[PDB]
Structures are given as C-alpha cells and as structure tokens.
Amino acid sequence: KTRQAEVNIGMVGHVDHGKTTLTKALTGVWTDTHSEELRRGITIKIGFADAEIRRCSNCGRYSTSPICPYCGHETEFIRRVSFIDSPGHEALMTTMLAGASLMDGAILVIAANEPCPRPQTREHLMALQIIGQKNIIIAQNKIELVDKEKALENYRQIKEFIKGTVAENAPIIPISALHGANIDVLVKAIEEFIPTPKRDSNKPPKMLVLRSFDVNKPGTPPEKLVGGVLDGSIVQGKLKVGDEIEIRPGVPYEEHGRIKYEPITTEIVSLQAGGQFVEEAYPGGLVGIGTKLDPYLTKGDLMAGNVVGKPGKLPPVWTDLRLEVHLLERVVGTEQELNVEPIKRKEVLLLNVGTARTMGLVTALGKDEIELKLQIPVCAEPGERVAISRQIGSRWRLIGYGIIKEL
Amino acid sequence: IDYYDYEKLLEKAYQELPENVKHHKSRFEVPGALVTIEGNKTIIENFKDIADALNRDPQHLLKFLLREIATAGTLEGRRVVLQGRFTPYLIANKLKKYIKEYVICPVCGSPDTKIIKRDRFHFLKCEACGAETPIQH
Ligand SMILES: Nc1nc2c(ncn2[C@@H]2O[C@H](COP(=O)(O)OP(=O)(O)O)[C@@H](O)[C@H]2O)c(=O)[nH]1
Ligand SMILES: [Mg+2]
Ligand SMILES: [Zn+2]
Ligand SMILES: [Zn+2]
C-alpha cells in the first residue's frame, strides 16, 4: 500500500483557542506544489491538511518534522495523517454532522486562558456527541498564558465539561501551539489514540467528491493531456488505477422533463495521494482521481457533491426526501437566531449530506418528520445523516439535522 | 509519562516554555515565530521583530541558526530565507536556545545582557550585574 494519510483528524474547538495555528504548525512542512501551506473550502468549507507523524531515532521523541526539532537528527516515518480544519464555526458544524463518515478522530482545542465551555466549544462537543466520534484528544492550549493556578482550574473545568460525553475519556494535554510546548506529547497521543481503524478494503468503493477540476490550461499540448479530475475522500473500500467507476448524480440533459441527471461512467487514469501518484488509493486524506472524461464536464467544480464507486454498487439517488428531524439546542448566536422556530410547510431549507449541498422545499409535516423536494438530486445511502440549515436574515444558520427515511 | 497525569505534563510543558516567559525575570516582548514554508524554502518574516526584541544584531542570529541548522539563508527587509523545509517548532526550538546562551545572564538572569568584545575573544554580557560570561557558547 501507500504511505498516504491513514486517518482524518478533525480540528474542533472554539473559534479562537487556536485550532488553525496548531494545524499549520504541524502541517506546514508537508505542502510543496500549488498550495502554499493553508486555505479553507468549497461548500463544506472543509480543508484537508496532511502531516507525517515521525519518531526521532536519537532522542526518541515524536514530531511532525523530518529533522528532529530538538536534537537535530533524522526522524523516522511512522504514519501519515490528515487534519480537517475549517474557519467558520458553522461550516465545521455542518461538515461534522453531514459527513461524519470522514473523521476518524478529532482534536478538541480548548484555550486555557478562558472559561472552559465557550458557546462554540459546546456545539462541537455536541456535534462530536451526535456522530458517535469517541476517539478524542483534548488540547488545552496557550498554557504559557495562565499561571499554574488558573491552569488547574481550567483543567478541572474541562473535566466537568466532558464527563458524560464522548470525550469523557480523552486526555487533556497542556500545550503551546505558539512555542511548541508538548507538541511531541500531543503528536505521540495521536498515535496512542486515533489509530488507523481496521477497514476491509474489499468492500465496494465509495468516494465523496469534494471537488472537480480541469487541470487543463493553455499549455496547449493536444495529445494525452489529462481529462476530468476529481478530489475526494474515499470512505469505503478502495480505488485502483485502471478501475471503471460510476459517477453518481451525473451530467444533466436537455429538458424532456425539466432537469434530469443521468449517472455517468468513466475510467480511472491516475490517482494522487500523499503528494505522489499511486496505483491504489485508500481512505485518509484527499484523493485526486484522473478520468478519461471530458474536462468540460468537471471544470468549475460541477461534479462536486457526487459520489464515485463501481458501476452498479452505489448509493440510491434521490429527487425527493423525507427526514427524521432533530432540532438542535444551539447556544452560539443571538436569542433570535437561537430559539429556532420549527420548520414550516413551504420553507426553503439548505441541505448538506456527504459533500453534496442542495436546497429543499418542505412539502409535508408530521411529528418530528418532514418532506422535501430536492433542488439537485443527491446520492445518499438511507440512514445517512443530512444537515439541515435555515436562512434567518441574509445568512444560513444550521438549525438541526435530519435522518434519511424512505418515502 | 502517561497522558493522564496532567501535573507532570504541566511541568513538562513549562521547561520548553521559553525563558522570557517561563520564569521570574521576564523580557516579555519576544513575539513568537512566524514561519512560512513556500515551495521548498522556509521563511521567518518576523525575524527583525525577534532580534529587535532581543536587542541583538540581525545577522548574529541568522548565523546561530544556520549553525544549529544546516541550511543557507539571507536576511532582507525584516525577513529571512531558509533553503529547506523547517517546521515552526524546529525554528521555535532554536531561538529558545539562542536566548539561553546569547541573551540571558546565567548568574543573574537579565535580558539586559549585551554582546561585548574585549579581545579577539567574545566575552559578552550583563549591564545589570556585571558578570562577563565568555559567550561563543
Ligand atoms: N500565546 C499563544 N498564542 C497562541 C497559541 N496558539 C495560538 N495562539 C494565538 O491564538 C490566535 C489564533 O488562534 P487561531 O489560529 O486564529 O484560532 P482559530 O480561531 O481557532 O482559527 C492567534 O493570535 C494565535 O497566534 C499558543 O500556543 N500560545
Ligand atoms: Mg481559522
Ligand atoms: Zn531527537
Ligand atoms: Zn547578570
């Protein structure tokens, strides 16, 4: 196999305790071409940052760097992981609930110089709790800003905050993303906790396309210059160069009905994963598939939201949708935004499932259940969680989530 | 040391914690490292700030680094270009050492140490206590 990323670690915590700083600090050195080190995403404004967890052969300490930060000797590769960072308390929230099938663990960053449970910090623990993500590591950051008295008071606070949650058994590592205090302890913990799960590669392939492009540019060679390319997170089984795949919703056609997407099939030419090209890619990090498809079809990220797999074995496409609605008890925001009024018949909601994003029209009401017609067909497996977001002014606010039921 | 013994973890976390910030005598104006790894080169564009905060020369530090590290760099308009790839902490760890053996007085900790030269020998030091440690290490 490859030294590609083996697990997706989510960076969650308040919007200022330092999630983005710690990420860059650990991933900076693993970004060489066409990506200066850090940026947020598409509709799930999700961002993937790779990092190679290594062990210093001389001092025996862990880091995310090739040359031991301390002694200076060469480190050894142990594993490759990928952090999912995202500026925007909402976007992260939406991503987590919707594509919970992407994360394998999460690092809860909680600033030590502020009351433990901050409005936003609660919502993530709330999201992590809803998607059954128990593999959590707590990073009490900015330890250099609180004397040992406050630190212990914070520690305690955190402990009371997590008891009775999925992060109830998570370590509380005091660190300094700024100076690097205990980063070695942390990195090591990512191995102790959040290990690569046992996945049966033989399961039929499924990838959630996060982006689609046309790497073509007036470079002009007309020969075998690459066709359509998709970037996503394999979430089941595996993709292999030379594989015949079936894209999901598909390409639209000329109004017989009004709008209709037909599933399309293509052949995988290339696969980038870990910065290099492989003949076989696996879940963990981002995967860049090369197809024989007309770039004219993937250009501008039109394919984004689709799912890939082997012809025949894919999820069921939907044109309508009923859901087991579960409104959330949100704390971040303003009282108005806060107490969500229940969804209404005819309201236009914003839906998130997998990497697909679409508007839906409430055409029915029941007891903690609703119906919706989709603006864009979405490929989904029943039972999968769908993020539901209502407008509220000019913005879109996440008010809850629904559970895919059959109609 | 297990991850559940927060206490030890806390003290382990404060030794790495810098001088100026770690203990009693605190030069406190040292702003942390700002590292940008572009293409195949590391650039700390916050350099001037560091030196000017440590009241040390600009090139006196460019050197201490290329020493503890094995790359080549040039200073320019308050920034520095390093020839390879280096994580913010690698550098973060080297500045820590500089402050320790080139900016602090070992008898009476004082950010007020200064580089002096009274012979071809570099004895540099203290404007507060007067101790003149021989620093080339
Ligand atoms: N003193 C100190 N500041 C930090 C540390 N980690 C992050 N910060 C600062 O906290 C602020 C940023 O947190 P940031 O990266 O913006 O947080 P985010 O909002 O969750 O994306 C910045 O000013 C950081 O440089 C740390 O370990 N020590
Ligand atoms: Mg951010
Ligand atoms: Zn070492
Ligand atoms: Zn002195």
What are the tokens at B46?
């916050």
- First CA to last CA across chain B, in angstroms? 31
Count of alpha carbons within 13 angstroms of residue A249, beta-carbon side: 29
**Is residue B35 within 8 Å of B71, Cβ to Cβ?**
no
Work out the number of other CB atoms within 10 angstroms of the CB of residue A228.
Answer: 26
Do A324 and A405 lie in one domain? The reply is yes
Question: Distance of alpha carbon A30 from its chain centroid, rounded?
Answer: 19
Nearest Cα neighbor of B111 from B129, B123, B94, B93 is: B129
- Helix axis angle, B88-102 to A19-27, nearest 10°: 90
**Is residue A355 within 8 Å of A210, Cβ to Cβ?**
yes
Do A94 and A126 lie in one domain? The reply is yes
- Alpha helix (H) ranges present in A262-369? 335-338
Cβ-based contacts of B68 with chain A (< 8 Å): 72
Report which protein residue has its CA nearest ligand 1's atom 4: A178
Strand partners, A291: A268
Range(s) of the domain holding residue A385: 315-407
Residue B114 CA to ligand 4 centre (angstroms): 10
**How many distinct structural domains can be found in chain A?**
3
Do A222 and A272 lie in one domain? The reply is yes
State the CATH number of the domain containing residue A322.
2.40.30.10
Question: Given the DSSP bridges, would you call strands A75-85 and A105-111 parallel, antiparallel or unpaired?
Answer: unpaired
Do A299 and A333 lie in one domain? The reply is no
State the CATH number of the domain containing residue A108.
3.40.50.300
> What ligand is nearest to the CA atom of residue A17?
1
B43 part of contact set with chain A, CB < 8 Å: no
For this PDB entry, the determination method is: X-ray
Pairwise CA distance, residues B40 & B29, whole Å? 31
What separation in angstroms does the CA of A295 have from each of A228, A232, A362, B1?
4, 17, 35, 54
**Of A145, A166, A199, which closes a domain?**
A199
Q: What does this entry list as its resolution, in Å?
A: 3.4
DSSP string computed for B3-69: TT-HHHHHHHHHHSS-HHHHSSS-----PPP-EEEETTEEEETTHHHHHHHHT--SHHHHHHHHHHS
**Is residue A328 within 8 Å of A343, Cβ to Cβ?**
no
Do A296 and A320 lie in one domain? The reply is no
Q: Which helix (H) or strand (E) holds A374?
A: strand A370-379
In a 3-state reduction of DSSP, which class is residue A15?
A: coil
Pairwise CA distance, residues A20 & A25, whole Å? 9
Beta strands in A260-396 (DSSP E): 261-262, 265-272, 280-281, 287-291, 307-309, 317-323, 326-327, 348-353, 356-365, 370-379, 385-390
- First CA to last CA across chain A, in angstroms? 42
Q: Which helix (H) or strand (E) holds B99?
A: helix B88-102
Do A151 and A269 lie in one domain? The reply is no
**Of A265, A280, A314, which closes a domain?**
A314
* Residues in contact with ligand 1 (CB, 6 Å cut-off): A 15-21, 87, 141-142, 144-145, 176-178
Report the nearest atom of ligand 1 relative to the CA of A85: 21
Question: Given the DSSP bridges, would you call strands B79-82 and B73-76 parallel, antiparallel or unpaired?
Answer: antiparallel
**Is residue A393 within 8 Å of A334, Cβ to Cβ?**
no
Question: Distance of alpha carbon A115 from its chain centroid, rounded?
Answer: 27
Count Cβ–Cβ pairs < 8 Å, chain A vs chain B: 97
**Of A314, A347, A369, which closes a domain?**
A314
**Is residue A74 within 8 Å of A57, Cβ to Cβ?**
yes
What are the tokens at A205?
């392939």
Pairwise CA distance, residues A36 & B91, whole Å? 19
Pairwise CA distance, residues A268 & B50, whole Å? 50
Do A34 and A123 lie in one domain? The reply is yes
Pairwise CA distance, residues A294 & A230, whole Å? 12
**Is residue A196 within 8 Å of A284, Cβ to Cβ?**
yes
Contact state of A28 with B93 under an 8 Å Cβ cutoff: no
**Is residue A20 within 8 Å of A39, Cβ to Cβ?**
no
Do A181 and A226 lie in one domain? The reply is no
DSSP conformational letter for B78: T
What are the tokens at A51?
């990092």
Tell the residue number behind the tokens 């559970």, with chain if given: A403
**Is residue B33 within 8 Å of B80, Cβ to Cβ?**
no
